[PDB]
Amino acid sequence: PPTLPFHGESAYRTDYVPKPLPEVAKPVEVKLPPTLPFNAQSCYRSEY
Amino acid sequence: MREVISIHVGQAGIQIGNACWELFCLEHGIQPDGQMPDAFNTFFSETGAGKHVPRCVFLDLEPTVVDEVRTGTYRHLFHPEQLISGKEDAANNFARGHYTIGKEIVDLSLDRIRKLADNCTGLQGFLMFNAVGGGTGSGLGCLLLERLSVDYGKKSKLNFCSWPSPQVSTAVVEPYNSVLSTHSLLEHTDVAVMLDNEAIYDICRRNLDIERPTYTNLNRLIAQVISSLTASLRFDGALNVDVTEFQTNLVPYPRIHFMLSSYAPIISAEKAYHEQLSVAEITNSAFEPASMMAKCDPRHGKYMACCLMYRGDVVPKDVNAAVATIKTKRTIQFVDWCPTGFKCGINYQPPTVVPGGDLAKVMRAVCMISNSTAIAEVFSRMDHKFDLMYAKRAFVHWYVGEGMEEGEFSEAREDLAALEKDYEEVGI
Ligand SMILES: Nc1nc2c(ncn2[C@@H]2O[C@H](COP(=O)(O)OP(=O)(O)OP(=O)(O)O)[C@@H](O)[C@H]2O)c(=O)[nH]1
Ligand SMILES: [Mg+2]
Numbered sequence: 001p002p003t004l005p006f007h008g009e010s011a012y013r014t015d016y017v018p019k020p021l022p023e024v025a026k027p028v029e030v031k032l033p034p035t036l037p038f039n040a041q042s043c044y045r046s047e048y
Numbered sequence: 049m050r051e052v053i054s055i056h057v058g059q060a061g062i063q064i065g066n067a068c069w070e071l072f073c074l075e076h077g078i079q080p081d082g083q084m085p086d087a088f089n090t091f092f093s094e095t096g097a098g099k100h101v102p103r104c105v106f107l108d109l110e111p112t113v114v115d116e117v118r119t120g121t122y123r124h125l126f127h128p129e130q131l132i133s134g135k136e137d138a139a140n141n142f143a144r145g146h147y148t149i150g151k152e153i154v155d156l157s158l159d160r161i162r163k164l165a166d167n168c169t170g171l172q173g174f175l176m177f178n179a180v181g182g183g184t185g186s187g188l189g190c191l192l193l194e195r196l197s198v199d200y201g202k203k204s205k206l207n208f209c210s211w212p213s214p215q216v217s218t219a220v221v222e223p224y225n226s227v228l229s230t231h232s233l234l235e236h237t238d239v240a241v242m243l244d245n246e247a248i249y250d251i252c253r254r255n256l257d258i259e260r261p262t263y264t265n266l267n268r269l270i271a272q273v274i275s276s277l278t279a280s281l282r283f284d285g286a287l288n289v290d291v292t293e294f295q296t297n298l299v300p301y302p303r304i305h306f307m308l309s310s311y312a313p314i315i316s317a318e319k320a321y322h323e324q325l326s327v328a329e330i331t332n333s334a335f336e337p338a339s340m341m342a343k344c345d346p347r348h349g350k351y352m353a354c355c356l357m358y359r360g361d362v363v364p365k366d367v368n369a370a371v372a373t374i375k376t377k378r379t380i381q382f383v384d385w386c387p388t389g390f391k392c393g394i395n396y397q398p399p400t401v402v403p404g405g406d407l408a409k410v411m412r413a414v415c416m417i418s419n420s421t422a423i424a425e426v427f428s429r430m431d432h433k434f435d436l437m438y439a440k441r442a443f444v445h446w447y448v449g450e451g452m453e454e455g456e457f458s459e460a461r462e463d464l465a466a467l468e469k470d471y472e473e474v475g476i
Contacts, residue, residue: 009404010063010066010067010116010120010264011063011066011067011070011264011265011267011268011271011405012066012067012069012070012120012122013120013121013122014402014403014404014405015067015070015268015402015403015404015405015406016070016071016074016075016400016402016403016405017074017403018074018077018079018085019075019077019400019401021077
């Protein structure tokens with residue numbers, strides 16, 4: 001008589017394989033608004 | 049520094065601990081031999097050339113299911129002292145496991161838990177997994193919690209049991225093992241979660257469509273509860289819920305620490321990519337009164353606190369709407385001394401596919417652990433069975449022979465009876 005060869009693979013042996021790592025490369029590139037150039041052009045030079 | 053020590057006692061504890069320790073190991077990516085080809089620190093040490101070793105203590109008195117661990121594929125990942133065995137089993141006999149054959153393996157277990165806790169820069173909690181209804185899970189496990197409470201105090205002892213199911217039990221003497229193990233689960237346990245087997249059968253046969261599930265498939269969904277419960281321990285998210293956060297928002301009074309589980313994005317291929325699984329859909333199915341993992345229907349109970357742990361690409365405002373629509377539903381009722389009754393956690397790491405498994409790719413998940421007065425029926429169900437069997441003293445000659453008097457039975461029914469009494473006085 002033959003031996004029924006043991007096929008069997010547990011939960012811990014089956015149901016996860018090493019996943020590919022998540023592809024993350026994205027910073028928050030913020031274009032700076034340039035400082036709005038200032039003429040609240042003062043009193044002395046403004047009127048006299 | 050975040051570090052949870054798992055202690056798996058009993059044959060069932062070894063098997064559910066198997067399916068757990070692969071959402072711990074190679075979800076972190078480590079190979080079967082123990083090499084990644086520091087998020088692993090939640091469950092693993094590190095021994096030089098990339099060897100991370102599980103922070104587990106395997107306990108059994110029969111050396112046949114732990115010997116499968118020593119001979120399986122994963123024999124070189126476990127250290128060959130973390131798989132502690134015995135010479136002879138406990139045989140559904142609470143008094144053998146606690147008084148006679150327990151006091152030769154407990155001294156080895158406390159050594160390995162010592163060497164695995166002095167390798168700790170701050171231990172979050174002992175996640176001990178057992179099976180109430182057997183001999184070494186109800187016996188040795190009860191003695192383990194009593195010894196761990198005296199020595200290792202003030203840090204949590206989250207216990208997920210395998211409480212005997214109402215009809216299906218595959219034993220006859222399990223009421224004696226359940227009622228007399230209630231003492232450890234009521235005093236020497238910080239968080240207890242009832243988790244039977246029929247409800248996992250029902251989830252597998254209704255959502256997951258596997259009409260013939262085996263214990264290996266039951267260990268699947270138990271493991272997915274554990275990974276989502278410690279998800280914020282290891283991975284970032286919008287809100288984190290560690291094991292100290294968990295017990296402080298779900299335990300109203302110190303004696304009441306019993307909860308229910310549900311992890312219901314349970315989908316499988318044909319029922320997976322057809323259904324849009326949004327945050328509202330998975331939250332409604334989590335609160336649904338058939339996916340509770342205890343046969344513990346809460347439609348006749350009062351909710352007390354909930355611990356919805358969203359996991360994946362979940363947006364916090366979608367969590368906010370999902371909580372709101374549960375509150376407006378009338379059959380989901382809450383006790384009156386709790387206007388805020390949810391502890392929402394969000395993980396960023398998505399749940400993991402299973403090759404050869406039962407689930408599939410899902411981008412989001414929920415795992416809510418909820419305390420309710422509905423959990424008073426899982427103990428009153430077994431009050432009927434203990435009362436019938438102890439009437440004419442069946443099976444008592446076993447339990448009395450090796451070292452407990454018959455008054456242990458009466459005081460444990462008294463401990464059970466004072467137990468359900470505290471639920472209806474809290475609910476009313
Ligand atoms: N989740 C799960 N439960 C199991 C498994 N095997 C048995 N059980 C449950 O365990 C209960 C019987 O208790 P056991 O776990 O076999 O008892 P034990 O912890 O091995 O202790 P002993 O009886 O001394 O061998 C049954 O009612 C089953 O519902 C399993 O592989 N997975
Ligand atoms: Mg056993």
